[PDB]
Copies of this chain bind each other. A is one copy, B any other.
Amino acid sequence: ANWEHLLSLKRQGDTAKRLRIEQDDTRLGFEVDYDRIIFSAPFRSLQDKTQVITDFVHTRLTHSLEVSVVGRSLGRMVGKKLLEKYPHLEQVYGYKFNDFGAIVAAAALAHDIGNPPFGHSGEKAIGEFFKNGYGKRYKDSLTAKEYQDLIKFEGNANGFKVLSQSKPGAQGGLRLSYATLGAFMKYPKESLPHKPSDHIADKKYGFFQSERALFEDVAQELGLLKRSTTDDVSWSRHPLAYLVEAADDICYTIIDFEDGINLGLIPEEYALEYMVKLVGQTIDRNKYNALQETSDRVSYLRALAIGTLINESVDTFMKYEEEILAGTFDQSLIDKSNYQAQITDIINLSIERIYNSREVIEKEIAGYEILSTLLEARCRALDNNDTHYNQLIQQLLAKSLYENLIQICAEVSTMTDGKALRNYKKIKGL
């Protein structure tokens, strides 16, 4: 692989090359990608989409924003070092350090844009509907990969669909730069085979069969290395996808901890105990001791721990840069961290006190009923579109059979929590 091609400014449908040296610096394709996501309806809808805890103040919008800020910093710091290592990228092709930050920031901003409501439970409810619920009746009319898309419905792949879906008058969706789409693709494989190895890039899949042809275009414009030895297609990650992943991992690990503490689920005394190693060399104890509010103290620790992990991730990336470029790096960047023990203790505490708290369990149980109900109504109307009731369902909630089912899943998944519950209540009469 080669950074000239990995940094492609191509947009869908382009007939001519886009030279980096010919970009208007006030209209740089990578920075335009950020703005197009910010102003898109799917991104705006994240305001009414909650994280694990429903407080009105912990939204999927804020997490996506904070992940993108951490990603911009990671891309900027790695970008400067890549241009020192590969100076022809600047001198000949015209690339600049902010370009790497723009790519990572845009891809990070949109990482959760396709996830269904209710978190991983939402994904499992959609899958269970097609594995064992009403939807399993379609198994014999779909390819193995088409059915695997449904029974293992993946929010990551739905995000790729959302970013690129074509509609009359809007071919290419948001038409993001191919480098940004490459940085977005954490799992560059189709739904089959399922988990062929223990590599992180193979734990899940990144595109539906409906988007296979699109990512094939992306994968070769970027010059990504083929990996699979079969008709089952798979590529090794765009190097910048490692930075998108590190930003999410850092923010999920540290900010969930901060949230659990501010919400009262995690006792405040655990903050210093679990983060002292991550913040020791940079913390100002007199500043810390002078802070009077709990929230101000843990946010201070949060900023210090994120700064530490950002710098360490940048160094880890450059240490393994050639292995990543060759598709031989077998781990995430955070897996190589010197703070793995502290990171694991933090994650396990968040699992026990937040993700397995009674309120979250209750929300996930209700999410199953809500999604299963919306999925059954749309699928029954698809099967019998002639009855008066199914026509009403058609107007309220809303090609080949597979295209209709994957579209139904994508639409149910991008519904706000408020719209999913409201439509659920009408289907039930409340």
Question: A128-B387, A366-B426 provided; 8 other pairs, C-beta below 8 A?
Answer: A125-B389, A128-B389, A132-B387, A365-B396, A369-B428, A373-B429, A421-B429, A424-B429
Nearest neighbor of A384 in chain B, beta-carbon distance: B132
Asked if A392 is an interface residue, CB under 8 A from chain B, the answer is yes
Asked if A370 is an interface residue, CB under 8 A from chain B, the answer is yes
On chain B, the residues within 8 Å of A364 by CB distance are 392
Contact between B424 and A370 (Cβ–Cβ < 8 Å)?
no
Contact between B369 and A427 (Cβ–Cβ < 8 Å)?
yes
Asked if A430 is an interface residue, CB under 8 A from chain B, the answer is yes
Question: For the side of the interface on A, what is the size category?
Answer: 20 to 34
Contact between A396 and B426 (Cβ–Cβ < 8 Å)?
no
- Residues of chain A in range 369-408 having any CB-CB distance to chain B below 8 Å: 369-370, 373, 387-389, 392-393, 395-396
Asked if A362 is an interface residue, CB under 8 A from chain B, the answer is yes
**Residue of A361, A363, A370 with most chain B CB atoms under a 10 A cut-off:** A361
Asked if A368 is an interface residue, CB under 8 A from chain B, the answer is yes
* With known contacts A370-B429, A429-B370, A430-B430, A365–B393 Cβ distance under 8 A: yes
Contact between B121 and A366 (Cβ–Cβ < 8 Å)?
no
Asked if A124 is an interface residue, CB under 8 A from chain B, the answer is yes
On chain B, the residues within 8 Å of A429 by CB distance are 366-367, 369-370, 373, 421, 424
Give the distance in Å from the alpha carbon of A373 to the alpha carbon of B427 in the complex. Answer: 12
Minimum CB–CB distance from A426 to chain B (whole Å) comes to 4
Give the distance in Å from the alpha carbon of A227 to the alpha carbon of B419 in the complex. Answer: 52
Give the distance in Å from the alpha carbon of A407 to the alpha carbon of B379 in the complex. Answer: 34
Give the distance in Å from the alpha carbon of A396 to the alpha carbon of B361 in the complex. Answer: 7
Closest 3 pairs between A and B when the two form their complex, measured CB to CB:
A366-B429, A369-B429, A362-B426
Contact between B128 and A388 (Cβ–Cβ < 8 Å)?
yes
Asked if A319 is an interface residue, CB under 8 A from chain B, the answer is no
Asked if A358 is an interface residue, CB under 8 A from chain B, the answer is yes
Give the distance in Å from the alpha carbon of A426 to the alpha carbon of B424 in the complex. Answer: 14
Asked if A228 is an interface residue, CB under 8 A from chain B, the answer is no
Asked if A311 is an interface residue, CB under 8 A from chain B, the answer is no
Contact between B388 and A124 (Cβ–Cβ < 8 Å)?
yes
Give the distance in Å from the alpha carbon of A370 to the alpha carbon of B427 in the complex. Answer: 10
Nearest neighbor of A423 in chain B, beta-carbon distance: B362
Minimum CB–CB distance from A272 to chain B (whole Å) comes to 30
Nearest neighbor of A395 in chain B, beta-carbon distance: B361
A-B contact pairs, 23 of them (CB 8 A): A121-B392, A124-B389, A125-B389, A128-B388, A128-B389, A132-B387, A358-B396, A361-B396, A362-B426, A363-B426, A364-B392, A365-B389, A365-B396, A365-B426, A365-B427, A366-B427, A366-B428, A366-B429, A367-B429, A368-B389, A369-B427, A369-B428, A370-B429
Nearest neighbor of A391 in chain B, beta-carbon distance: B361
Asked if A356 is an interface residue, CB under 8 A from chain B, the answer is yes
On chain B, the residues within 8 Å of A363 by CB distance are 426
Give the distance in Å from the alpha carbon of A137 to the alpha carbon of B5 in the complex. Answer: 62
Nearest neighbor of A427 in chain B, beta-carbon distance: B365
On chain B, the residues within 8 Å of A393 by CB distance are 365
Nearest neighbor of A387 in chain B, beta-carbon distance: B128
Nearest neighbor of A132 in chain B, beta-carbon distance: B387
Minimum CB–CB distance from A50 to chain B (whole Å) comes to 15
